[PDB]
């Protein structure tokens, strides 16, 4: 295996200086990544893989072969969130965060809407299949449950499916932060599910801090999405580009906020809303600590700006 390198995007979102506070290894926190599957035994991933599930064709299955990445995309996205900080490969934004790999996309990267809807439900129910096992009314941020705190969706399309949208509303109202790619058509507004008001739409910058021209406009925040090196099957590494690559940077920063807030207070922040500019919710903190590029304030290119984990966490803890 090759010696560890830090991909430029990990440095760009200011993640490494947070790790001494937390690398996301606060046991209550998990990130669900709804994608093509994962290379579950990849040496730079395996120890962070808490659950590997499939919802393809209606069936929930944890058979390894059912849950394994047959495309490469999911393994790449997951390594950007949580590739381990060790002597090999790469390193994620939250290199100690627990991952749920929820395969909702086939070998080609296509998914049906009820498969993705079911994926969202699985992220809430978690490996034990029960939402609120101890009946205390708390799901996200409850160490007695195994619900994810972040659902990351590096996928999207022009289609708005109400069944999937209902699942999103359920997760959001459970206190789960939802993050998704704005899309790759240079379009005037984000694909769904990014375009849902409950969801953080993520646009893609390059290494010069320019918005990538394929990045769909009107995102909520933006993140590294060009020349992104991460993990790839089989026990390998590969470089990809797209708002799918920017998304996991934002999910990692969210995992760091919630892990650091929990470590200090014994609880997590509310998700918040698009318009939030206070330090009282996850999204408010993302918006006000982002590097504001382009026109001052929120803009159609960068949204609120480039996410910055070191400032986000400082805002969350102060
Ligand atoms: Ca949890
Ligand atoms: Ca492997
Ligand atoms: Ca590594
Ligand atoms: Ca559960
Ligand atoms: Ca509970
Ligand atoms: Ca509890
Ligand atoms: Ca701006």
UniProtKB/Swiss-Prot annotation:
Residues 7-313 form the Peptidase S8 domain. It is an enzyme of class 3 (hydrolase). Thermostable. Highly active at 80 degrees Celsius. Its EC number is 3.4.21.-. GO terms for molecular function: identical protein binding; serine-type endopeptidase activity. The keyword Secreted applies. The active site is at 35 (charge relay system), 73 (charge relay system), 244 (charge relay system). Optimum pH is 9.5. GO terms for biological process: proteolysis. It comes from the Archaea. Has a broad substrate specificity with a slight preference to large hydrophobic amino acid residues at the P1 position. Monomer. This is Tk-subtilisin. The chain holds residues 105 to 422 of 422 of the full protein.
């Amino acid at each position: 295996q090759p010696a560890q390198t830090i991909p430029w995007g990990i440095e760009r979102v200011k993640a490494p200086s947070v790790w001494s506070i937390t690398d996301g290894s606060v046991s209550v926190i998990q990130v669900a990544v709804l994608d093509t599957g994962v290379d579950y035994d990849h040496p730079d991933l395996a120890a962070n893989i808490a659950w590997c599930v499939s919802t393809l064709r209606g069936k929930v299955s944890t058979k390894l072969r059912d849950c394994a990445d047959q495309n490469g995309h999911g393994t790449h996205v997951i390594g950007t969130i949580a590739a381990l900080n060790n002597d090999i490969g790469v390193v994620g934004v939250a290199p100690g965060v627990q991952i749920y790999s929820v395969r909702v996309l086939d070998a080609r990267g296509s998914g049906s809407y009820s498969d993705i809807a079911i994926g969202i439900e699985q992220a809430i129910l978690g490996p034990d299949g029960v939402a609120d096992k101890d009946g205390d009314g708390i799901i996200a941020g409850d160490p007695d449950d195994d619900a994810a705190e972040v659902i990351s969706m590096s996928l999207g399309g022009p289609a708005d499916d109400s069944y999937l949208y209902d699942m999103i509303i359920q997760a959001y109202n459970a206190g789960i932060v939802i993050v998704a790619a704005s899309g790759n058509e240079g379009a005037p507004s984000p694909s769904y599910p990014a375009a849902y008001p409950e969801v953080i739409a993520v646009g893609a910058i390059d290494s010069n801090d320019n918005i990538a021209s394929f990045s769909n406009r009107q995102p909520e925040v933006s993140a590294p999405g060009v020349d992104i090196l991460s993990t790839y099957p089989d026990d390998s590494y590969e470089t990809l580009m797209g708002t799918a690559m920017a998304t996991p940077h934002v999910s990692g920063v969210v995992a760091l906020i919630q892990a650091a807030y929990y470590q200090k207070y014994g609880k997590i922040l509310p998700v918040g809303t698009f318009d939030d500019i206070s330090k009282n919710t996850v999204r408010g903190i993302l918006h006000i600590t982002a590097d504001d590029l382009g026109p001052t304030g929120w803009d159609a290119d960068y949204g609120y700006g480039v996410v910055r984990a070191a400032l986000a966490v400082q805002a969350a803890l102060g």
